[PDB]
Amino acid sequence: GFNGGFG
Amino acid sequence: GFNGGFG
Amino acid sequence: GFNGGFG
Amino acid sequence: GFNGGFG
Amino acid sequence: GFNGGFG
Amino acid sequence: GFNGGFG
Amino acid sequence: GFNGGFG
Amino acid sequence: GFNGGFG
Amino acid sequence: GFNGGFG
Amino acid sequence: GFNGGFG
Numbered sequence: 001g002f003n004g005g006f007g
Numbered sequence: 008g009f010n011g012g013f014g
Numbered sequence: 015g016f017n018g019g020f021g
Numbered sequence: 022g023f024n025g026g027f028g
Numbered sequence: 029g030f031n032g033g034f035g
Numbered sequence: 036g037f038n039g040g041f042g
Numbered sequence: 043g044f045n046g047g048f049g
Numbered sequence: 050g051f052n053g054g055f056g
Numbered sequence: 057g058f059n060g061g062f063g
Numbered sequence: 064g065f066n067g068g069f070g
Contacts, residue, residue, distance in 0.1 A: 002061070005011035005018065006066045009054070009070050012018035012025065013059045016047070016063050019025035019032065020052045023040070023056050026032035027045045030049050034038045037044045043050045052059045058065045 002009045002068045002070045003011055005013055005068065007014045008015045009061045009063045009068060010017045012061065013020045013066055016023045016054045016056045016061060017025055019027055019054065020059055021028045022029045023047045023049045023054060024031045026047065027034045027052055030040045030042045030047060033040065034045055040047045042049045046053045048055045050057045054061045056063045060067045063070045
């Protein structure tokens, strides 16, 4: 799984 | 699964 | 599953 | 499933 | 299923 | 452009 | 561009 | 560009 | 560019 | 550029 991201 | 995204 | 998105 | 979207 | 959309 | 949402 | 969301 | 979210 | 999120 | 998040 992936949690988070890109500003 | 994926949670989050892109600003 | 996918939750989130794109600004 | 997909939840979210695009600004 | 899909929930959400496009601004 | 293309906007597409798919269940 | 292309915006696509897929369950 | 390309924005894509995939379950 | 390319923004992609994958479960 | 390329932004990618993968479960």
